[PDB]
Every structure is written in C-alpha cells, then in structure tokens.
Amino acid sequence: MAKVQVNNVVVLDNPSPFYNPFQFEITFECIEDLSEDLEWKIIYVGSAESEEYDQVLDSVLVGPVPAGRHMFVFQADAPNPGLIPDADAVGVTVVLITCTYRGQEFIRVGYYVNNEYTETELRENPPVKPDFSKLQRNILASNPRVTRFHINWE
Amino acid sequence: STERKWAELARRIRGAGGVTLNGF
Structure with a gap:
C-alpha cells in the first residue's frame, strides 16, 4: 500500500x-514510481516544554x-542558540527527521540528543549563560525512534 | 531530568496517530 519505505x-x-x-x-x-515530490525535513526540538522553540534546520524536495x-x-546547519531557552541548552533534547508526500507526514525518525560540556570545569559547574561554543552535540544514533x-497515495 | 520532560520528549518523537518501534 505505502509507496515509500525507509x-x-x-x-x-x-x-x-x-x-x-x-x-x-x-x-x-x-515500491512504486511517484509522480510528485518527497519532502524531507530536519527539525530541532529547541525546548521539550514548548513547540514554540522548534527550528526547521533544513528542508529538501x-x-x-x-x-x-x-x-x-541530508545535511543541515546547526540550530540557532538565540532561539534555544537557557534551561534546555544543556542536557537531553530531540532532533527529528520527517518525510511528507502531498502535504502528508508518513514517516518520522526521531533521535535523542545529548548536549554536554566536555571540559571538566564547565561540566562540574555549568554557567548561567550557556557557552554554546564548548557544547558537544551527541546524537543517540543506536536508538532511532521510528x-x-x-x-493517501493518490 | 523529570518524568514530565521525558514524557514531553516522547510525545515530540512519536508525533500523533502512528506506530512507534525502535529500529527500522
């Protein structure tokens, strides 16, 4: 039935x-030939508390x-730290990979993402203002959440 | 992290009205 399989x-x-x-x-x-385009999107969850903080990092037809x-x-530029609330900067968040065909989401691959300091001083005592230039993004690639x-494939 | 934050992140992952599984 479903024309595209990930x-x-x-x-x-x-x-x-x-x-x-x-x-x-x-x-x-x-599985079959599609006459229309398959739109792929990379969505960064800037804040677990609100959908206001989502950032579409890239979109491809x-x-x-x-x-x-x-x-x-599928490549995408880093999120904007100025759009990310301070309380969600350090710790765990989510990046999403979605695909639509005629405005309809049929696939969503989600990853847990771990944003942490690698420096001993910073990890033990994190600043009030997050220093994004020192944060390492570690995606949980072994746990893809599909x-x-x-x-409708009309 | 609190449960409400893991639950909030779970919801964002699965979206709404689909079937979620670990792996392809």
Missing part, C-alpha cells in the same frame, strides 16, 4: 561541536522518485 538512517559526524552541521545518510525503497532503492545525504503514519 530502510535506514545513518547518523554521520557524531559526536560534534554544537555549531557543526548535521549529517544523515538516508536509504529508502520505492526529492523527486520524481522511480521504483527501487535510493540513497542521499514512527509510520497512514497516508
């Missing part, structure tokens, strides 16, 4: 400094995809 997502350049870009090698299998296995690297949604 085979795997490989998290590249992990870990990396907070300001360094996101890298993802995406594999998907096309892929198509017209013919039947068969396909692969691509959600499929029932969509």
